[PDB]
Design a protein around this ligand. Structure first.
Ligand SMILES: CCCCCCCCCCCCCCCCCC(=O)OC[C@H](COP(=O)([O-])OCC(O)COP(=O)([O-])OC[C@@H](COC(=O)CCCCCCCCCCCCCCCCC)OC(=O)CCCCCCCCCCCCCCCCC)OC(=O)CCCCCCCCCCCCCCCCC
Ligand SMILES: CCCCCCCCCCCCCCCCCC(=O)OC[C@H](COP(=O)([O-])OCC(O)COP(=O)([O-])OC[C@@H](COC(=O)CCCCCCCCCCCCCCCCC)OC(=O)CCCCCCCCCCCCCCCCC)OC(=O)CCCCCCCCCCCCCCCCC
Ligand SMILES: CC(C)=CCC/C(C)=C/CC/C(C)=C\CC/C(C)=C/CC/C(C)=C/CC/C(C)=C/CC/C(C)=C/CC/C(C)=C/CC/C(C)=C/CC1=C(C)C(=O)c2ccccc2C1=O
Ligand SMILES: CC(C)=CCC/C(C)=C/CC/C(C)=C\CC/C(C)=C/CC/C(C)=C/CC/C(C)=C/CC/C(C)=C\CC/C(C)=C\CC/C(C)=C/CC1=C(C)C(=O)c2ccccc2C1=O
Ligand SMILES: CCCCCCCCCCCCCCCC(=O)O[C@H](COC(=O)CCCCCCC[C@@H](C)CCCCCCCCC)COP(=O)(O)O[C@H]1[C@H](O)[C@H](O)[C@H](O)[C@@H](O)[C@@H]1O
Ligand SMILES: CCCCCCCC/C=C\CCCCCCCC(=O)OC[C@H](COP(=O)(O)OCCN)OC(=O)CCCCCCCCCCCCCCC
Ligand code: HEC
Ligand code: HEC
Ligand code: HEM
Ligand code: HEM
Ligand SMILES: COc1ccn2nc(C)c(C(=O)NCc3ccc(N4CCC(c5ccc(OC(F)(F)F)cc5)CC4)cc3)c2c1
Ligand code: FES
Lengths: 105, 139, 75, 218, 524, 185
């Protein structure tokens, strides 16, 4: 959940302009390098840190990596609410999740 | 040695005078009485110079003239064999490394580093002290 | 290969010579590798200046050694 | 005498206004607003000593019930969370230790262990910042820490982490920091780095020293 | 036992091979026990592992704990983790045994590395022994991977993270084969049902068998190609000077074995290693901050940390970053066993060698080895980034860049310094060969001159100066007390003196025996 | 040659510098005693004099034993030296153990370093002296081990003498500290 104060520094990757519901963004938690949980989230730098080899993704710039051997952005999930007020998924990831291989991401 | 003792006696006399004067001038005329922090330093620097001067005085009274203390002398007087001056040794740098390890372990509060530094200091000092006394190996 | 004994006393007891071309080419290659490491996710440029500063010293040393060896002041 | 925050707004004016403003407005150079925050934020920030700052943990400046003074003065200018109290009016402690350490430990490993540790030792974050050790913090400090969400630490509300969940996490932390090591001297709480160091600097030197003693040198 | 010995002799009549093995001579240098250390560690590993196999259950099915350890009751875990907890808390003396096992694994790895360093620096891999070097390299690789598979068995959070990252997601990224290897090894996607039993079978049966065969072959080759030795008084390329097996060598070897077992028991009782209960069972959703494998894979981890993110994307495909780690580790593992052939191709020396070299006489190889050790140390320290940056207050990005740059500028600096240091040591040896040993005594020489009273090691000329000796590859004394100069203390016990006759007799017989040993070994 | 001894002069000047160090500590102590008015040893603190007298007499006996050992050393026999120095080591160890016991029994129910000013200055003044005593013990052990490994020469005698009067300096500054802390108050 992003503070309402900023909400103007978001960059919104080319194919996922409507994947967020207000101030919720819901990125994946599997690091795009070798698959450890990227769970270290710094609340006022908006950086996600993978503790296995220390990559850093920019939560305000479609989870773009900004340090380390990580080279691909984290996948984003589309969300919304249902007719009762609960958070549901609005589809599927647009691309595979996790480490890469010969075929594709 | 006669002149070193006289130097230290001069210094001790002046330091004792200054200490007493400061103590009795701050006992009165001062805000809170005796100052208690310069007084102590002064009496104990007096004690330092006193210890050194008294040792030099005893050694001078227990000694016969020396070619250094003696004028009138020639280089054939000191002809002889001096003491033992250590040639090359590598233990000082290890002692310094150990002490620096202990110091940096005390700066950042890390007890294991302090313990390791103390052990290394003991080991290096033992190596320095025994360097010219170890005998040949027994096989 | 061969080295005179007055430079390396134990020159006949073991390997004691490495050709200078290896060292020069290695210095140049290491400088190039330090330079090519500006490709990444470096936002911020404090780290690039150390890369450029360490790659200039290596090149300076290699050039000095090459120039002095070329004019006979060394070897 | 709860109608007395004249103390409170006597200490703030002489220790805080240079970085937060006279009206708790967040001097646009250094400090945040401090309006929406409550008594819990002030308690955690001052009792641990991170407050008035020249941010690491230090020695506290204020007690003799003046942490209450500043806390009440700041609560009177907003609606932030408040510190838990016991039936005497003081702040509580030991009854916020859930009869349940399994659930508390699972919650700690899922939510808290990523930044601190398996057992609450420190952890390093990016570019300076780190996550401190959880050993010297008491119970109310743990509660207010995960309730107010201090610098770069996420904020766990009372709706996503209910009060039982918080009490059980507190109990697990306080038990994990005070249990023995039933295998000998633990080498700091971390993984194989202290173990490898201890091997190389104890076992190998013992073995090589005995090899030097037994065998001759030539 | 005359009757039994004779009946053995008429049934087997060895009596000549036993005599041939009881008279074998072994050199006595403290540096020749670094392999015995590894051998004894391996024996202890075998014994403790055989003990451990009686209680371990290698399944990946889920259960609820319901045991004695209370802070984990009701948690759902695999069967291997529960079996390890049961070993730790419900068998009298099980925690002690698994701690001994882990400490012995660590000592095994460390002793192997120190032994390799000795073999490399003394030059004991030359013409007759390249194959023995190759066998040793294979043993090193196998030991690394065996320890890895071993500590990944009781699947907890840390072991699970290590498995996942390294094995799964580096095997998954190989260019063409890749996922095929991953699915052949795991039976499917990463968290399977056949991984832990397969690792168990590999760890208790196959790799120990291969290691045992290779160790047997190694020791056989060392036994039949007699040991090397350092140059010295009576040493030649055609003889072995030392002690016979018969009374002495077996005794020293057994005493060393007992002392190593003692050290391992002490540090397995007093220091704690791998407390799996502080962790939890492995779950793909939670993580901690340390990470870190044991110190013999830390270089692999550090190489993965400090390698820049260089990937290639071309038509319909992707080559990720860890491929680089793969080729670099393969290159290291290929450059290790093929070194003697490289050195003999480059230096062009193909002769038999039975006398070792002092590391100061071969400056280039010593510099190469020091450079490699510096590289390894940089890679290992780059693996504990988090711990270093937390305990010592340094930035994390700072440590990453420090490692990334050190990886290039530290090896050459170390090379330069090591070369110059070796030549300095050579010069210091030549100075004490030309003049005598400095005694440290000063005189004043009535016309005011200061001299320092050297002490010659050989004959002297007409005017008192010693004639210079020739270097013979052997170490030279530098302190006057190492030569018998100031010795012979009293002959009491510690507080009460003995008689004068006893002191004189003992001193005099000791001097005589020393002189006789010297004169005997010279003359041969 | 070298009629006055060199190691002696070195040790003497170094002991003077150490005296200045303890001067700094004393200056720390006397301030904060002028500020605390009234019962300046606070109420939870009261010093047990039933234990501080025997340890002081033990230290003085140690000084006597060390002087006897030096007397034995000046004539070239190692065994009298070894006996007297073993006795001195044992008595110093007893002194250190007694001091540690008093630290335990005094921190048990009151005075701590971070809990008071008197406790701070008290522990700071006496712990450094304890460290000096431990250093002296280490020096004794090293000297004995060195006499074990070669014949007795005048250099060993000089080493024994300098270690001796280092020990004397230690147990004199202890008398100063004791008379200042336990009696003057
Ligand atoms: C027109 C005419 C002019 C008239 C002449 C006037 C003369 C001077 C005027 C010129 C004006 C320029 C003035 C600018 C200032 C100069 C700067 C300077 O001082 O330079 C030092 C300069 C050096 O002296 P020099 O005269 O060049 O000495 C002759 C050479 O040493 C002789 O030795 P060498 O050069 O033959 O030896 C070669 C050596 C050259 O070394 C040097 O000479 C000096 C440089 C070495 C320093 C550090 C080592 C390299 C590390 C690089 C990064 C460093 C950060 O190369 C090396 O060995 C280095 C290691 C190479 C590693 C390669 C690995 C091989 C293994 C292959 C395996 C494959 C793996 C691949 C990966 C590995 C990556 C490579 O002078 C000095 O200041 C020191 C003099 C002696 C030292 C005394 C103590 C000094 C105290 C310091 C304070
Ligand atoms: C960063 C700043 C840079 C720091 C600079 C590096 C410091 C190095 C200082 C030690 C240098 C040792 C040395 O050069 O001896 C020459 C030595 C032989 O000297 P020599 O004059 O030809 O005498 C041979 C004759 O046959 C005549 O031989 P000898 O019978 O007359 O006596 C020779 C000696 C045997 O000669 C040796 O090889 C001694 C080997 C000592 C290695 C140094 C340990 C590190 O005899 C012994 O066995 C006595 C030593 C017994 C074991 C050593 C006990 C170590 C105590 C450690 C306590 C202190 C803690 C360390 C610091 C803690 C925190 C860092 O050969 C070596 O160069 C050994 C290589 C050591 C260099 C690498 C060590 C440091 C590497 C990086 C450090 C970072
Ligand atoms: C990043 C890497 C690649 C480089 C950074 C390293 C460096 C910058 C750190 C210190 C730098 C320093 C201040 C420079 C000046 C110092 C210099 C003048 C001499 C002193 C140098 C000495 C003191 C260095 C100390 C050696 C140190 C780096 C090795 C630490 C080994 C490991 C990582 C420690 C982990 C560790 C161990 C090993 C325990 O045994 C232990 C036992 C009980 C509790 C906890 C621990 C524990 O955390
Ligand atoms: C000798 C050399 C390696 C052969 C070169 C042959 C040829 C060049 C092969 C190419 C290899 C090149 C390309 C890459 C090198 C890296 C790679 C090969 C790693 C594979 C592993 C293997 C080769 C190990 C290398 C040799 C090994 C490192 C010997 C080091 C030990 C020896 C020389 C001295 C030990 C003495 C010991 C008793 C006292 C040291 C005290 C402490 C400070 C040791 C340092 C230390 C170490 C060494 C740790 O591993 C460690 C791990 C975790 C925490 C702390 C430490 C730690 O403090
Ligand atoms: C080359 C070796 C690489 C390893 C696999 C073998 C050849 C790969 C060959 C390959 O590239 O695709 C494969 C084509 O299937 C196959 O033959 C199965 C493997 C057998 C190879 C052919 C039979 C051997 C005679 C898989 O395609 P697929 O997983 O079915 O669908 C994908 C989408 O996800 C995605 O939208 C996108 O359209 C693609 O990624 C697509 O492939
Ligand atoms: C600087 C040295 C200063 C004085 C040395 C003499 C020590 C005097 C010993 C008496 C201590 C005492 O009795 O104080 C009891 C208190 C109760 O405090 P607490 O909070 O209630 O308990 C909760 C405990 N965590 O424990 C303590 O402070 C612990 C005392 C710490 C031990 C002293 C440190 C020695 C380190 C030596 C430095 C070497 C570095 C060399 C590098 C150049
Ligand atoms: C300018 C120096 C400075 C002084 C003096 C100071 N603060 Fe702070 N304070 C800060 C800064 C900067 C922060 C931002 C928090 C952070 O980044 O750690 C902060 C944060 C806080 C917070 C938490 C804000 C939040 O959103 O959770 C509170 C509460 C607070 N201060 C209260 C106080 C109190 C109480 C005092 C003592 C009278 C004080 N401040 C004095 C600088 C200061
Ligand atoms: C890496 C993100 C992160 C997460 C997730 C996290 N912490 Fe923190 N924690 C921090 C940081 C950063 C600080 C330091 C804040 C400060 O100093 O102002 C901190 C401080 C604390 C402190 C104060 C320690 C002390 O000694 O004063 C406690 C207690 C604490 N956290 C508990 C928790 C608990 C319980 C959880 C799990 C609900 C948790 N933390 C999760 C990063 C985190
Ligand atoms: C030869 C080299 C060996 C190495 C390097 C090695 C290493 C290891 C290590 C580090 C562990 C982790 C133990 C723990 O963390 O508790 C382990 C586990 C284990 N080892 Fe070994 N081991 C070796 C040989 C053997 C042998 C020969 C056996 C049996 C005959 C064996 C049986 C076991 C068993 C059953 C376990 C799992 C039990 C447990 O984890 O508690 N090991 N091994
Ligand atoms: C489990 C692994 C290993 C064991 C048990 C082992 C054991 C031994 C032993 C006991 C010796 C003879 C005694 C001694 O030299 O001290 C020896 C010699 C030797 N080792 Fe190893 N070693 C191992 C690994 C290696 C490695 C990694 C190399 C490279 C290597 C190469 C050699 C060579 C060439 C010799 C002959 C040395 C000589 O004859 O002087 N071995 N090994
Ligand atoms: C414990 O906590 C943690 C936390 C974080 N990390 N991060 C790392 C890196 C680790 C860690 O354990 N590293 C050690 C390691 C590294 C690589 C392998 N591979 C084996 C299989 C793989 C492979 C690749 C290609 C192949 O192709 C062919 F078959 F050879 F042809 C075959 C095999 C090769 C390398 C095995 C162990 C770790 C541990
Ligand atoms: S696993 Fe997240 S950085 Fe490699």
């Amino acid at each position: 959940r992003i503070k309402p104060s900023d909400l103007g520094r978001v960059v919104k990757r080319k194919g996922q302009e409507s994947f967020n519901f207000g101030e919720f963004f819901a990125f994946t938690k599997v690091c795009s390098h070798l698959g450890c949980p990227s769970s270290l989230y710094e609340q006022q730098s908006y950086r996600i840190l993978c503790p296995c080899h220390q990559s850093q993704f920019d939560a305000l710039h479609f989870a773009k990596p900004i340090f380390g051997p990580a080279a691909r952005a984290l996948a984003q999930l589309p969300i919304t609410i249902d007719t009762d007020g609960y958070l549901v998924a609005n589809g599927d990831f647009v691309e595979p999740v996790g480490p890469a291989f010969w075929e594709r991401t | 040695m006669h002149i070193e003792a006289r130097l230290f006696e001069i210094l001790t006399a002046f330091f004792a005078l200054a200490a007493v004067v400061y103590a009795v001038l701050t006992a009165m005329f001062a805000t809170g009485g005796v100052e208690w922090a310069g007084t102590t330093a002064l009496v104990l620097t007096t004690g330092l110079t006193l210890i050194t001067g008294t040792f030099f005085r005893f050694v001078a009274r227990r000694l016969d003239t020396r070619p250094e203390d003696y004028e009138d002398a020639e280089i054939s007087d000191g002809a002889g064999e001096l003491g033992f001056f250590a040639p090359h040794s590598w233990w000082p740098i290890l002692i310094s490394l150990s002490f620096s390890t202990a110091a940096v372990g005390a700066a950042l509060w890390l007890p294991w580093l302090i313990a390791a530094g103390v052990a290394f200091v003991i080991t290096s000092v033992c190596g320095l002290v025994f360097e010219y006394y170890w005998g040949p190996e027994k096989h | 290969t061969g080295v005179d004994v007055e430079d390396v006393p134990s020159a006949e007891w073991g390997w004691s010579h490495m050709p200078i071309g290896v060292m020069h080419i290695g210095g140049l290659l290491s400088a190039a590798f330090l330079l090519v490491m500006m490709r990444g996710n470096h936002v911020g440029h404090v780290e690039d200046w150390f890369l450029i500063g360490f790659a200039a010293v290596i090149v300076a040393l290699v050039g000095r050694n090459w120039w002095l060896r070329r004019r006979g002041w060394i070897r | 005498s709860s109608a007395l925050l004249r103390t409170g707004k006597q200490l703030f004016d002489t220790s805080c206004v240079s970085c937060h403003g006279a009206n708790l407005q967040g001097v646009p150079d250094h400090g945040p607003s401090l309006i929406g925050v409550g008594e819990a934020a002030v308690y955690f920030q001052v009792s641990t000593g991170r407050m008035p700052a020249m941010a690491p943990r230090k020695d506290p400046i204020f007690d003799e019930a003046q942490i209450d003074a500043i806390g009440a003065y700041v609560q009177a200018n907003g609606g932030g969370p408040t510190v838990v109290r016991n039936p005497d009016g003081s702040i509580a402690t030991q009854s916020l230790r859930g009869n349940d350490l399994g659930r508390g430990g699972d919650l700690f490993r899922l939510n808290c262990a990523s930044c601190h540790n398996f057992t609450g030792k420190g952890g390093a974050l990016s570019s300076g910042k780190y996550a401190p050790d959880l050993a010297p913090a008491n119970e109310q400090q743990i509660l207010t820490a995960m309730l107010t969400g201090p610098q770069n630490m996420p904020k766990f509300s009372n709706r996503q982490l209910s009060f039982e969940a918080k009490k059980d996490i507190i109990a697990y932390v306080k038990v994990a920091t005070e249990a023995r090591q039933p295998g000998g001297y633990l080498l700091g709480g971390f993984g194989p780095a202290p173990e490898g160091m201890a091997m190389w600097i104890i076992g190998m030197v013992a073995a090589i020293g005995l090899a030097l003693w037994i065998g001759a040198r030539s | 036992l005359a009757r039994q010995a004779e009946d053995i002799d008429t049934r087997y009549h060895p009596s000549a091979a036993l005599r041939r093995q009881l008279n074998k001579v072994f050199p006595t240098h403290w540096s020749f026990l670094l392999g015995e250390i590894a051998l004894y560690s391996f024996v202890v590993l075998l014994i403790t592992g055989v003990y451990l196999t009686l209680f371990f259950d290698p399944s990946m099915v889920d259960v609820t704990y319901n045991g004695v350890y209370q802070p984990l009751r009701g948690v759902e875990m695999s069967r291997a983790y529960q079996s390890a907890l049961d070993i730790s808390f419900e068998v009298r003396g099980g925690l002690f045994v698994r701690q001994i096992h882990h400490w012995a694994a660590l000592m095994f790895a460390a002793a192997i590395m120190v032994h390799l360093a000795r073999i490399f620096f003394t030059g004991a891999f030359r013409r007759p022994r390249e194959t023995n070097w190759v066998i040793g390299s294979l043993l090193l690789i196998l030991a690394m991977f065996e320890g890895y598979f071993g500590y990944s068995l009781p699947d907890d959070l840390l072991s699970g993270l290590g498995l996942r990252a390294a094995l799964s997601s580096i095997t998954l990224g190989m260019p063409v084969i890749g996922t095929w290897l991953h699915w052949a090894l795991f039976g499917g996607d990463f968290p399977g049902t056949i991984l832990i039993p397969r690792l168990y079978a590999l760890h208790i049966l196959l790799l120990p068998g291969i290691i045992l065969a290779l160790i047997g072959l190694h020791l056989a080759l060392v036994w039949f190609q007699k040991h090397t030795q350092f140059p010295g008084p009576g040493r030649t390329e055609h003889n072995v000077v030392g002690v016979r097996v018969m009374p002495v060598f077996a005794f020293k070897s057994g005493a060393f074995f007992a002392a190593i077992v003692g050290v391992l028991g002490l540090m397995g009782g007093l220091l704690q290693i791998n407390p799996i209960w502080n962790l939890g069972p492995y779950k793909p959703s939670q993580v901690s901050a340390g990470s870190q494998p044991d110190f013999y894979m830390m270089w692999t981890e550090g190489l993965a940390r400090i390698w820049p993110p260089w990937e290639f994307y071309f038509w319909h495909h992707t080559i990720p970053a860890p491929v680089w780690v793969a080729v670099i580790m393969g290159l290291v593992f290929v450059l290790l066993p093929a070194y003697p052939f490289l050195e003999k191709r480059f230096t062009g020396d193909y002769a038999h060698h039975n006398l070792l070299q002092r590391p100061r006489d071969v400056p280039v190889r010593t510099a190469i080895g020091a450079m490699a050790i510096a590289f390894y140390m940089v890679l290992t320290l780059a693996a504990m980034n988090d711990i270093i940056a937390l305990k010592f207050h340094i930035s994390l990005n700072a440590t990453t860049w420090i490692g990334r740059i050190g990886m290039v500028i530290l090896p050459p600096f170390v090379y330069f310094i090591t070369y110059r240091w070796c030549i300095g040591l050579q010069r210091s040896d030549r100075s004490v060969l030309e003049h005598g040993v400095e005694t440290g005594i000063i005189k004043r020489l009535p016309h005011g001159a200061y001299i320092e009273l050297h002490q010659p090691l050989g004959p002297v000329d007409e005017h008192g100066h010693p004639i210079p000796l020739q270097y013979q590859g052997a170490p030279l004394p530098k302190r006057m007390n190492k030569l018998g100069s100031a010795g012979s203390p009293g002959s009491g016990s510690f507080l009460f003196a003995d008689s004068a006759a006893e002191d004189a007799a003992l001193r005099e017989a000791g001097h005589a025996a020393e002189q006789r040993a010297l004169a005997a070994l010279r003359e041969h | 040659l070298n009629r006055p001894n060199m190691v002696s002069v070195g040790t003497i000047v170094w002991l003077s510098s150490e005296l200045m160090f303890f001067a700094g500590l004393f200056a720390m102590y006397f301030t904060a005693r002028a500020q605390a008015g009234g019962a300046w040893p606070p109420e939870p603190t009261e010093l047990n004099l039933a234990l501080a007298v025997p340890v002081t007499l033990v230290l003085i006996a140690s000084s006597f034993t060390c002087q006897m050992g030096v007397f034995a050393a000046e004539r070239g026999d190692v065994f009298g030296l070894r006996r007297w120095y073993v006795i001195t080591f044992l008595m110093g160890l007893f002194f250190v153990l007694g001091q540690g016991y008093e630290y335990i029994h005094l921190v048990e129910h009151g005075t701590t370093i971070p809990g008071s000013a008197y406790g701070s200055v008290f522990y700071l003044a006496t712990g450094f002296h304890g460290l000096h005593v431990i250093g002296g013990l280490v020096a004794f052990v090293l000297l004995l081990a060195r006499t074990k490994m070669s014949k007795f020469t005048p250099a060993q005698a000089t080493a024994a003498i300098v270690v001796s009067y280092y020990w004397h300096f230690v147990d004199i500054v202890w008398i100063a500290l004791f008379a200042t802390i336990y009696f003057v108050r």
